[PDB]
Short mmCIF file of C-alpha atoms and ligand atoms in Angstrom, two decimals:
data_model
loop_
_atom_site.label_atom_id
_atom_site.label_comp_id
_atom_site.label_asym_id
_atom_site.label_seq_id
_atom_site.Cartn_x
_atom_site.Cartn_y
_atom_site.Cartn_z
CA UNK A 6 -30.91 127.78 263.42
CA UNK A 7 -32.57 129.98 260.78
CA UNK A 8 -29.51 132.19 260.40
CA UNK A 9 -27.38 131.17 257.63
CA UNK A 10 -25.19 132.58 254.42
CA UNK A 11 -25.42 132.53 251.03
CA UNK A 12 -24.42 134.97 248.67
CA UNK A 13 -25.30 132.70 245.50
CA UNK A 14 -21.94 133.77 243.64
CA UNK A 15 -22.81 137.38 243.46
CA UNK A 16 -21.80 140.73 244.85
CA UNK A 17 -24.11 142.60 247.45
CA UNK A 18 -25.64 145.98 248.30
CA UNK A 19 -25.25 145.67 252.12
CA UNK A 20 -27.12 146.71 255.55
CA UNK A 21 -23.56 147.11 257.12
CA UNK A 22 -22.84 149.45 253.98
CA UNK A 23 -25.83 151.32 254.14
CA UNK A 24 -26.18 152.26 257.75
CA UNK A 25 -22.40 154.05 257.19
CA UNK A 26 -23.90 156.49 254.94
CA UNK A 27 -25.71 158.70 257.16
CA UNK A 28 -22.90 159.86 258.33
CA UNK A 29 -20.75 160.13 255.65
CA UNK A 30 -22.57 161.98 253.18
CA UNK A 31 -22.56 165.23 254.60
CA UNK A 32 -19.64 166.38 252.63
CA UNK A 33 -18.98 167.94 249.04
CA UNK A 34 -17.41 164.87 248.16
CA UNK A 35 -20.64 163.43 247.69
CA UNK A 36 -23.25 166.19 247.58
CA UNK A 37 -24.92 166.72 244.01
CA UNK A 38 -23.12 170.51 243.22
CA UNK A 39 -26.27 173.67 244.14
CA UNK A 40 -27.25 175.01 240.73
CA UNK A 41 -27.82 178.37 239.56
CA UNK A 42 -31.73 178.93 239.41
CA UNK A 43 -31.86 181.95 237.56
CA UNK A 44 -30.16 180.21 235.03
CA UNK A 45 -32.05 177.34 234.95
CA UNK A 46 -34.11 177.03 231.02
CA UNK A 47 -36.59 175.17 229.84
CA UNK A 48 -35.16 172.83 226.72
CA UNK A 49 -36.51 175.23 223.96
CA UNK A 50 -37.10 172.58 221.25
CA UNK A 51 -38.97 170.17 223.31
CA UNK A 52 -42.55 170.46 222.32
CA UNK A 53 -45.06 167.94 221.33
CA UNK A 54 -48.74 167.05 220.68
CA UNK A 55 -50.78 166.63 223.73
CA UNK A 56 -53.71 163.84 223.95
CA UNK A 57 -56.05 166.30 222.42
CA UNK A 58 -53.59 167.16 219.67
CA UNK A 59 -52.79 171.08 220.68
CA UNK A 60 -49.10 171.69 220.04
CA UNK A 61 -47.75 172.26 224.31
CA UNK A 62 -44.20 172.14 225.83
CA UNK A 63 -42.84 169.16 227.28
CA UNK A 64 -41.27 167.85 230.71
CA UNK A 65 -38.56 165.78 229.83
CA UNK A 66 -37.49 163.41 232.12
CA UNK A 67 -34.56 160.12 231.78
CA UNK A 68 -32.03 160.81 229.09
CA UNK A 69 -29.46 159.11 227.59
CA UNK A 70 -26.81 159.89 225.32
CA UNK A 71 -26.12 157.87 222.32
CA UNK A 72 -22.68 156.17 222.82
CA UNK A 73 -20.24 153.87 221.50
CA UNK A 74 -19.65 150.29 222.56
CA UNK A 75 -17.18 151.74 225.39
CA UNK A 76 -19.38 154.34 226.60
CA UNK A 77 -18.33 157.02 225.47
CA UNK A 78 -20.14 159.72 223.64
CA UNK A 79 -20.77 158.89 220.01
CA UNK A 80 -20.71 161.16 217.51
CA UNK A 81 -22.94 160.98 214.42
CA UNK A 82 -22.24 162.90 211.24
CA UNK A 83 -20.95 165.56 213.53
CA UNK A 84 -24.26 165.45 215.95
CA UNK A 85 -24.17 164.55 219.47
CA UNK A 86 -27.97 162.67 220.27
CA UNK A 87 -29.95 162.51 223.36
CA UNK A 88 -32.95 159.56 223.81
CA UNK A 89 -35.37 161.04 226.83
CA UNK A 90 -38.38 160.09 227.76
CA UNK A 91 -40.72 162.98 227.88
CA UNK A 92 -44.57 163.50 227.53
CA UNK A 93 -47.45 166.11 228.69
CA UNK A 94 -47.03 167.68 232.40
CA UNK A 95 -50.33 166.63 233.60
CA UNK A 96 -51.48 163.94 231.73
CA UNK A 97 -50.22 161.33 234.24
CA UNK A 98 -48.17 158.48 233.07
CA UNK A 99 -47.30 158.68 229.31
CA UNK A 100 -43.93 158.55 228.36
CA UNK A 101 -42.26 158.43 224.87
CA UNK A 102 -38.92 158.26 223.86
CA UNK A 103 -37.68 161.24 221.97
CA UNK A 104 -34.25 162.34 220.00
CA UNK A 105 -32.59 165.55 220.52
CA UNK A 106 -29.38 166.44 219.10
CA UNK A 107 -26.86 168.85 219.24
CA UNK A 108 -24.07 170.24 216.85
CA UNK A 109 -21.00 168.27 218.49
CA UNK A 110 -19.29 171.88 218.90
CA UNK A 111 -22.84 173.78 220.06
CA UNK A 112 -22.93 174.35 224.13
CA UNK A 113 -26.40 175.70 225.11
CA UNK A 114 -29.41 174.00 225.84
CA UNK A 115 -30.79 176.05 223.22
CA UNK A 116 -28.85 174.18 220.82
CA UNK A 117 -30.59 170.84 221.20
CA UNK A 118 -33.04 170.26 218.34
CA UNK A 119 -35.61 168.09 218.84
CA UNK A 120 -36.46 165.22 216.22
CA UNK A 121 -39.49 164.04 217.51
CA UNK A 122 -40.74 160.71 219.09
CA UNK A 123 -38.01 157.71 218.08
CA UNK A 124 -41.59 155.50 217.58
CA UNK A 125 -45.34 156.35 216.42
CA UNK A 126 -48.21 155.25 218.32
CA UNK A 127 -48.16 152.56 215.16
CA UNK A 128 -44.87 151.41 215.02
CA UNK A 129 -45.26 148.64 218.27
CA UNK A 130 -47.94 146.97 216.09
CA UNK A 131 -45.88 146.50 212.94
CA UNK A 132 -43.41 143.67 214.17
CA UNK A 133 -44.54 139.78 215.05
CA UNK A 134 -43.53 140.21 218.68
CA UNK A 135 -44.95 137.99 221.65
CA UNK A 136 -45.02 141.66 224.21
CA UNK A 137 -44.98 144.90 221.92
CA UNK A 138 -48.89 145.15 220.88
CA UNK A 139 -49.32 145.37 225.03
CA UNK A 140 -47.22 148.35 225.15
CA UNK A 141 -48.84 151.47 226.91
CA UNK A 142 -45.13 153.55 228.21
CA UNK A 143 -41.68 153.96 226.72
CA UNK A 144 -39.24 153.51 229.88
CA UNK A 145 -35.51 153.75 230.28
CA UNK A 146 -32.65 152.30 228.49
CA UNK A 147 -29.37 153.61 226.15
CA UNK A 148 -28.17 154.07 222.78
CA UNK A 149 -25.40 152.53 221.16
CA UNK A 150 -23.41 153.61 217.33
CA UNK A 151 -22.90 149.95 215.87
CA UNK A 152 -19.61 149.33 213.50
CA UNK A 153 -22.33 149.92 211.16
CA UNK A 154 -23.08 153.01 211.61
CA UNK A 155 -26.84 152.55 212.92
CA UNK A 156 -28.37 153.67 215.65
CA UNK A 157 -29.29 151.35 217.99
CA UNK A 158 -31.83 151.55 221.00
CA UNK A 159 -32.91 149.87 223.74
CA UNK A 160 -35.39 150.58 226.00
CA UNK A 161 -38.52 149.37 228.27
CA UNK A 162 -41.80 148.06 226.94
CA UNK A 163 -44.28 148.72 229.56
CA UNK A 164 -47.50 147.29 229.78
CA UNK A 165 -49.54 149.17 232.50
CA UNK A 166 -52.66 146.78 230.82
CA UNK A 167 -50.42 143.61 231.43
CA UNK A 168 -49.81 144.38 235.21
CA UNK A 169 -46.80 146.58 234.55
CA UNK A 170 -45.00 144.14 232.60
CA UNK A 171 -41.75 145.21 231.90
CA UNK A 172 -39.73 143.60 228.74
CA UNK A 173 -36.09 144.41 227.47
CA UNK A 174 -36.53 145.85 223.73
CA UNK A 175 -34.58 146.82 220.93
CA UNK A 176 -34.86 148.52 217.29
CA UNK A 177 -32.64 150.21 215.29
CA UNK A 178 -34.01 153.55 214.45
CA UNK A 179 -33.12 155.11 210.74
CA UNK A 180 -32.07 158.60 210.21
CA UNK A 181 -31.50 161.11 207.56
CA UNK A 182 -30.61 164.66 207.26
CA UNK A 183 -32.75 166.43 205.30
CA UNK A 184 -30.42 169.21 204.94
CA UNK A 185 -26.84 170.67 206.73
CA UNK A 186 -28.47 171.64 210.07
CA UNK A 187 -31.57 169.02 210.39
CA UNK A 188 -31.64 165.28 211.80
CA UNK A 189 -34.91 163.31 210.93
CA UNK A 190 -36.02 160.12 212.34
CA UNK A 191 -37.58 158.10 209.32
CA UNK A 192 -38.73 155.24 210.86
CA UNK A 193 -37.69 152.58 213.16
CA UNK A 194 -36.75 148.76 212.19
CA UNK A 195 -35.87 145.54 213.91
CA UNK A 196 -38.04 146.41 216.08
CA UNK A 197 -38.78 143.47 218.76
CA UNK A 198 -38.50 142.54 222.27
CA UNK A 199 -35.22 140.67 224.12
CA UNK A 200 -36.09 139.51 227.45
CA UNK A 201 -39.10 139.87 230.13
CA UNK A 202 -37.46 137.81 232.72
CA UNK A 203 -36.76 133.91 233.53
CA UNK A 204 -37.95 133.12 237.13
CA UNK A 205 -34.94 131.40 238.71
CA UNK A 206 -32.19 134.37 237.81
CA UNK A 207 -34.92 137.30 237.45
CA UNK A 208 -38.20 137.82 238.74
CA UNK A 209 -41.25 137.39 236.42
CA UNK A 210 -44.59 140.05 236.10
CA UNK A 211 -46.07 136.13 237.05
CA UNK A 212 -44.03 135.91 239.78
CA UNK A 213 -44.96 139.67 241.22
CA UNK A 214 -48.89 138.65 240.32
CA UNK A 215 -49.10 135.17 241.72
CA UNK A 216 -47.75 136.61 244.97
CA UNK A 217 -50.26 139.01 245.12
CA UNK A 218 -47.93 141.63 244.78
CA UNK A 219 -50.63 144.70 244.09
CA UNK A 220 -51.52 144.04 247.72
CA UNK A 221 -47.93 143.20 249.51
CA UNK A 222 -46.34 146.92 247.70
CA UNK A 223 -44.34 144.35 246.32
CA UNK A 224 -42.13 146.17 243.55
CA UNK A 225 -41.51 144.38 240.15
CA UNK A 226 -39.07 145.44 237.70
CA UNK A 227 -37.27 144.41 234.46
CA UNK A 228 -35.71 147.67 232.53
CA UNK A 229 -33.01 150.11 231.95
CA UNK A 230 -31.39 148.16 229.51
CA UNK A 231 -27.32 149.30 229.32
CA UNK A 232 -25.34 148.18 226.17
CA UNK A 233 -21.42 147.29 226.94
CA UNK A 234 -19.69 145.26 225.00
CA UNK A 235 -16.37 143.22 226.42
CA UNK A 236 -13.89 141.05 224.71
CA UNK A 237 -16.35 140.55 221.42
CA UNK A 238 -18.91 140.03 223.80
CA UNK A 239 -22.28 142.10 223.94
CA UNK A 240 -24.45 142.86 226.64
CA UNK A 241 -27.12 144.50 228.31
CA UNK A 242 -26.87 145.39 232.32
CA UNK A 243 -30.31 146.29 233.28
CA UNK A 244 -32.46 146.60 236.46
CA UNK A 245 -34.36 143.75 237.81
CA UNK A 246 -35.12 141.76 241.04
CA UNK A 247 -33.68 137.94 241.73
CA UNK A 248 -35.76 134.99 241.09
CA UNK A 249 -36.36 131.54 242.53
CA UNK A 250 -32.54 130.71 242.41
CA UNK A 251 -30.45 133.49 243.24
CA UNK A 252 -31.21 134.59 246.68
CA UNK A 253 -35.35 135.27 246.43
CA UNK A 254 -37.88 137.91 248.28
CA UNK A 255 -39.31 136.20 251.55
CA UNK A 256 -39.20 136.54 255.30
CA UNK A 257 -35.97 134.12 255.43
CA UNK A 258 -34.19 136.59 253.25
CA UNK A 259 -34.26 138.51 256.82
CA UNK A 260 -31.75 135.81 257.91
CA UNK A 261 -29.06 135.75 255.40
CA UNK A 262 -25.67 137.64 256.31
CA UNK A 263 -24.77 137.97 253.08
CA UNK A 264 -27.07 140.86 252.99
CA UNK A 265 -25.89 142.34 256.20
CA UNK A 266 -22.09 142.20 255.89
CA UNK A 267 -20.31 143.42 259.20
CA UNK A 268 -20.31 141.52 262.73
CA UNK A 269 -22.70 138.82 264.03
CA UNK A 270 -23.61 141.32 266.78
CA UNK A 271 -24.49 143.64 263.84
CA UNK A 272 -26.38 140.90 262.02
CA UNK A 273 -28.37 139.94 265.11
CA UNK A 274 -29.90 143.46 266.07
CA UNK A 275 -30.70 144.56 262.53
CA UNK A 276 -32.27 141.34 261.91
CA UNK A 277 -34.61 141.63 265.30
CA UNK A 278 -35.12 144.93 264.70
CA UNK A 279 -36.12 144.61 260.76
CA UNK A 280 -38.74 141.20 262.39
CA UNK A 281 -39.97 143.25 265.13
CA UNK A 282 -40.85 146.19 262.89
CA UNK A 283 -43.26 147.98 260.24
CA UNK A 284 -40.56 147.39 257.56
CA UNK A 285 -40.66 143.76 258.26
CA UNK A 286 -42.56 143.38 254.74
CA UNK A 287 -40.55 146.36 252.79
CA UNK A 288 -37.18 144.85 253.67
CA UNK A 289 -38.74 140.86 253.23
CA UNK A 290 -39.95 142.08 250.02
CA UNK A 291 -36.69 144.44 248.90
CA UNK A 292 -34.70 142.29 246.48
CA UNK A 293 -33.74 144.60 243.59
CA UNK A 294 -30.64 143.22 241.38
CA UNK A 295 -28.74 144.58 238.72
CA UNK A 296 -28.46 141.66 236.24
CA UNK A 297 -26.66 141.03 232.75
CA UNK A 298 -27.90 139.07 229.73
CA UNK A 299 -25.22 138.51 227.04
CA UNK A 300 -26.80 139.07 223.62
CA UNK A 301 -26.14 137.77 219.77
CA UNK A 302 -24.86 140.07 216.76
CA UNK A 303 -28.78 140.27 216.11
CA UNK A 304 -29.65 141.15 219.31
CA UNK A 305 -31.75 138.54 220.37
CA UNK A 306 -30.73 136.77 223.56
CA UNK A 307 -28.14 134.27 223.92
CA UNK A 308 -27.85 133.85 227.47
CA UNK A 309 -29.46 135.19 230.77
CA UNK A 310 -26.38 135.28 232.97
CA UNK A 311 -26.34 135.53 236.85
CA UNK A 312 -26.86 139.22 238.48
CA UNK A 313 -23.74 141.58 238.99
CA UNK A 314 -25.03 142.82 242.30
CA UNK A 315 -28.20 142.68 244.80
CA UNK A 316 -29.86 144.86 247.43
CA UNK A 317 -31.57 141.87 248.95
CA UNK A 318 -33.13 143.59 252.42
CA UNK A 319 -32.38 147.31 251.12
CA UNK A 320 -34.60 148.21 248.37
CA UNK A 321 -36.60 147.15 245.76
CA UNK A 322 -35.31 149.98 243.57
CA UNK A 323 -31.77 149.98 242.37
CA UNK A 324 -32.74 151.99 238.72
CA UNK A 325 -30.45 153.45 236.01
CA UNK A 326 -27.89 150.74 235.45
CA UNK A 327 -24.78 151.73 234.24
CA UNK A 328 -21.28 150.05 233.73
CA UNK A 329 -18.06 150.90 231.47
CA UNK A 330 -14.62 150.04 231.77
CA UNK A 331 -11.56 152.82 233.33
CA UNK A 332 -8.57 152.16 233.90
CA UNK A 333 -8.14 148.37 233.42
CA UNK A 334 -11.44 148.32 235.55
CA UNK A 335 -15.46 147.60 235.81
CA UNK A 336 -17.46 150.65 237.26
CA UNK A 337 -20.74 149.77 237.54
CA UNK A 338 -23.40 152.11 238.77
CA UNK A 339 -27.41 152.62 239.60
CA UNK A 340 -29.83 154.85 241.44
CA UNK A 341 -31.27 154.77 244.53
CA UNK A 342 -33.96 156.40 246.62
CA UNK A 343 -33.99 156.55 250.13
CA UNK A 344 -37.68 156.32 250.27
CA UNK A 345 -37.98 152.61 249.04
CA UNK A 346 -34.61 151.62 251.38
CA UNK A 347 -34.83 150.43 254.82
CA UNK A 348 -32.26 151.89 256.10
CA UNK A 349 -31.88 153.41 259.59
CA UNK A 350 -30.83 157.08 259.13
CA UNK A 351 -32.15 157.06 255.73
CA UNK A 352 -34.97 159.01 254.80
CA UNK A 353 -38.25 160.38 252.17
CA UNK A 354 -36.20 162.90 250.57
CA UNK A 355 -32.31 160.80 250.21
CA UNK A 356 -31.51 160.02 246.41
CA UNK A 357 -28.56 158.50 245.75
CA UNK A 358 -26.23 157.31 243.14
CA UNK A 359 -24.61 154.51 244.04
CA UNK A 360 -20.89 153.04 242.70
CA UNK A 361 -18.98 149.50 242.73
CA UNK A 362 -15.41 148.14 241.30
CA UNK A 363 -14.39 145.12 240.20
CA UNK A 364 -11.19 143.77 238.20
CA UNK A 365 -13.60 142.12 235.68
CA UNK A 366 -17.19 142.50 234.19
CA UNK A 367 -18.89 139.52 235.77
CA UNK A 368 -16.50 139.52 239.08
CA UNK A 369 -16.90 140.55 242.89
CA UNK A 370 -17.94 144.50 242.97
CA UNK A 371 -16.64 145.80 246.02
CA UNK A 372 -17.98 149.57 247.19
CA UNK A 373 -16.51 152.76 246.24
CA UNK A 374 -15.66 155.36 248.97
CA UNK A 375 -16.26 152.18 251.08
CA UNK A 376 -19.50 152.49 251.62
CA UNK A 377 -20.42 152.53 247.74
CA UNK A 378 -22.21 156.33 248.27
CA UNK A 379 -21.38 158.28 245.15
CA UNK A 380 -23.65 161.20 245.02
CA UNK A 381 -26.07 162.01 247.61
CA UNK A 382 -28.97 164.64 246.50
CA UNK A 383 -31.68 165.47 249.32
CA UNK A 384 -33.30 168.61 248.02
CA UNK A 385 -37.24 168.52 248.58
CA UNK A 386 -38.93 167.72 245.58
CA UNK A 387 -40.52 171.11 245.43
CA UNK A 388 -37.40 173.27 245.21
CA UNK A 389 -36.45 174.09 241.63
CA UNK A 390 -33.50 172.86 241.38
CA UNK A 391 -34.35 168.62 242.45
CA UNK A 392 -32.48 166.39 240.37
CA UNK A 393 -33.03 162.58 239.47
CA UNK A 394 -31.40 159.97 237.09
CA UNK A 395 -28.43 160.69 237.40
CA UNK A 396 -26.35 159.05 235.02
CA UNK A 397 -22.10 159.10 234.31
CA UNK A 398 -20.97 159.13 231.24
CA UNK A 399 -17.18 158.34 230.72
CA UNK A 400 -15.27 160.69 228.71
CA UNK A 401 -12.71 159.50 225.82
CA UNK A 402 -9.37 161.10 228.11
CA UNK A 403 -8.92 162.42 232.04
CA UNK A 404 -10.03 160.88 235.17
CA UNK A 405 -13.59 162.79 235.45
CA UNK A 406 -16.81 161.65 234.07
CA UNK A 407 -19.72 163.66 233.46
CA UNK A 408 -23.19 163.53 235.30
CA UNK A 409 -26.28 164.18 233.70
CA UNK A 410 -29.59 164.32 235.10
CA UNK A 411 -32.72 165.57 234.87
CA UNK A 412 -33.91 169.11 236.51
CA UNK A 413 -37.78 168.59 237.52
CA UNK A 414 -38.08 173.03 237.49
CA UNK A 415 -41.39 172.97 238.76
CA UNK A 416 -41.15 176.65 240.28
CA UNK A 417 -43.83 179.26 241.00
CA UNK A 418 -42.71 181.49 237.68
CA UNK A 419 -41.64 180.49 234.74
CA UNK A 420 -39.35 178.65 233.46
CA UNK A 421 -41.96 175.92 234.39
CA UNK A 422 -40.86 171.97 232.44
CA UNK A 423 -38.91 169.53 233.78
CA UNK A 424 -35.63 169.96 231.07
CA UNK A 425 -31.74 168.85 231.30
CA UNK A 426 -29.44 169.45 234.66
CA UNK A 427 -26.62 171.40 234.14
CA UNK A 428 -24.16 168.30 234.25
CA UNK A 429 -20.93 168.27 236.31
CA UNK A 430 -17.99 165.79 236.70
CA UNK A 431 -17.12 163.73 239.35
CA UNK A 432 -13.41 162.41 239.49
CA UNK A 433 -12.93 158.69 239.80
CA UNK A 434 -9.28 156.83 241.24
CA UNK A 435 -9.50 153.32 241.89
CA UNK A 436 -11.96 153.35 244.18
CA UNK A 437 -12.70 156.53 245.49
CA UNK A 438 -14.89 159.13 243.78
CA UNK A 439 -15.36 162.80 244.07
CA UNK A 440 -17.17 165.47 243.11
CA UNK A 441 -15.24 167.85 241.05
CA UNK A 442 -14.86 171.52 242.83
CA UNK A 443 -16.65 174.49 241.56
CA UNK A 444 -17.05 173.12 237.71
CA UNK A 445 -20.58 172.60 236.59
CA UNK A 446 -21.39 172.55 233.31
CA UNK A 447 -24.34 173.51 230.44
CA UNK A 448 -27.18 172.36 230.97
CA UNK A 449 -27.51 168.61 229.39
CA UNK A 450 -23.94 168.48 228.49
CA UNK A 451 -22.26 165.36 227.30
CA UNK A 452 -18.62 166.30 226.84
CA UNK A 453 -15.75 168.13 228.73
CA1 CA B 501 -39.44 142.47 245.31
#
């Protein structure tokens, strides 16, 4: 018949997996820890230039620390640095990547600096690159401390004029200290784009158009680039959606068990269900992927490797790719809103980070806690305290890793900016997470 399995040599986000979370999450296993509100502050040193040029506060949004090749927190003449993107509260969509930093021994939010914008509004017209001249937004990505002590980003070109073309970029960005307590961001350099996607292995902008995806809510994306290096080996483990090859978007998608996992009676009434029903289209459509391109000691591309994982039938949106290595194995994580799933039980105002193992970097990722649920946050995006992003960072000894996030803080008084989350740890053995009792953190802290 039409039914059939293929799971095109990859790992999967499954229905099965999904549909178990509902009524797991429920517990402070999972749950994102309540914060403090009146404690909550606005990130002091983030202000900026609005359009019209009057001096204003941020909301800062995404961050990511800068790390070394393992993950771990780098440390840069005896700074810790933050990349976020961050831009004016009401003029819409602009986002720019700034650096804060922090005395490595320094605790309070008040103790982040800011640096200023890693780029000027110049600096993507500099380079002879086929995407960066297109560039209208500075998305997602991480920072990595190279054996040569530079400081090396990645991020997302993209082009809201080029149908929200997404590219893979990198630059290393020079710094100074013009005296004991400042950082400065001179300029940036090697400056040019890595990857926009293939077709067969990742979906194209092309691809997204050609389908008419504007008028299908067809989601197309190609960023969060996450540097991890393995056995001499570099990478990048970013957020995209499959191509042509690898298991595509489409109505016969709906007939694939690999997506479903579980039973054939299982397979056979979500299937009729998903066919029958409004989210025929969302779930036909829903084939995010979080792939992995292997790149040279210049950091061009050497090769576009298959996916480590799909949500084929789930979501379109599996954001914030992250991997690093504990304990002799692969963690790889990304997050997830329950608004773009199609998942019975899940609903508008579900976020979730969601977690995977496997023995090696390119192998089978099976789920953590089962079900692969890692955090579960479901305040309402008016309260105060909503976080997003969240992002583990591994630490250089124990079992816990910290979370960051972002804290939108849109409350009726003041403080009024989106600014850092206090972070908190989560506990990971083998393959079972948890959060860690009663012990959040600073506000944007890197580093038990
Ligand atoms: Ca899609």
């Amino acid at each position: 018949s039409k039914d059939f399995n293929n799971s095109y040599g990859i790992s999967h986000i499954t229905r099965d997996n999904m549909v178990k979370i509902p009524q797991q999450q429920n517990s402070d296993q999972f749950k994102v820890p309540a914060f403090d509100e009146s404690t909550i502050k606005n990130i002091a040193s983030a202000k900026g230039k609005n359009a019209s040029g009057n001096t204003i506060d941020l909301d800062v949004w995404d961050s990511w620390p800068l790390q070394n090749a393992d993950g771990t927190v780098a440390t840069y003449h005896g700074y810790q640095i933050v990349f976020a993107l961050a831009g004016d509260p009401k003029d819409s969509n602009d986002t720019s990547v700034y650096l804060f930093y922090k005395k490595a021994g320094d605790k309070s939010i008040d103790s982040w600096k800011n640096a200023g914008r890693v780029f000027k509004d110049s600096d993507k017209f500099v380079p002879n690159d086929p995407h960066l001249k297109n560039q209208t937004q500075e998305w997602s990505g991480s920072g990595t401390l190279t054996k040569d002590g530079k400081v090396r980003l990645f991020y997302t070109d993209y082009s809201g004029k080029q149908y929200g073309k997404q590219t893979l970029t990198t630059a290393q960005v020079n710094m100074s200290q013009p005296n004991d307590n400042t950082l400065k961001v001179d300029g940036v350099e090697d400056y040019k784009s890595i990857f926009d996607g293939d077709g067969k292995i990742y979906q194209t902008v092309q691809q997204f158009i050609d389908e008419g995806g504007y008028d299908t809510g067809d989601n197309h994306t190609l960023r969060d680039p996450h540097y991890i290096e393995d056995n001499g080996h570099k990478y990048l483990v970013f957020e995209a959606n499959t191509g042509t090859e690898d298991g595509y978007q489409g109505e016969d998608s709906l007939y694939n068990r690999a997506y479903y996992g579980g039973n054939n009676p299982f397979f056979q009434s979500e299937k009729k269900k998903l066919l029958e029903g409004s989210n025929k289209e969302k779930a036909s459509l829903a084939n995010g992927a979080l792939g992995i391109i292997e790149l040279n000691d210049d950091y061009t591309l050497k090769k576009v490797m298959k996916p480590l994982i799909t949500s084929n039938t789930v979501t379109d949106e599996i954001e914030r790719a992250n991997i690093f290595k504990k304990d002799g194995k692969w963690y790889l994580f990304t997050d997830s809103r329950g608004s773009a799933m199609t998942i019975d039980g899940i609903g508008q105002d579900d976020v979730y980070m969601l977690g995977y193992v496997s023995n090696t970097l390119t192998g089978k990722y099976k789920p953590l806690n089962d079900t692969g649920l890692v955090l579960h946050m479901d305040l309402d995006p008016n309260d105060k305290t909503f976080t997003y992003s969240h992002f583990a960072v591994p630490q250089t000894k124990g079992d816990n890793v910290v979370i960051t996030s972002y804290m939108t803080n849109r409350g009726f008084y003041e403080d009024n900016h989106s600014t850092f989350a206090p972070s908190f740890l989560v506990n990971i053995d083998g393959s079972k997470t948890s959060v860690v009792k009663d012990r959040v953190l600073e506000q944007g802290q890197l580093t038990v």
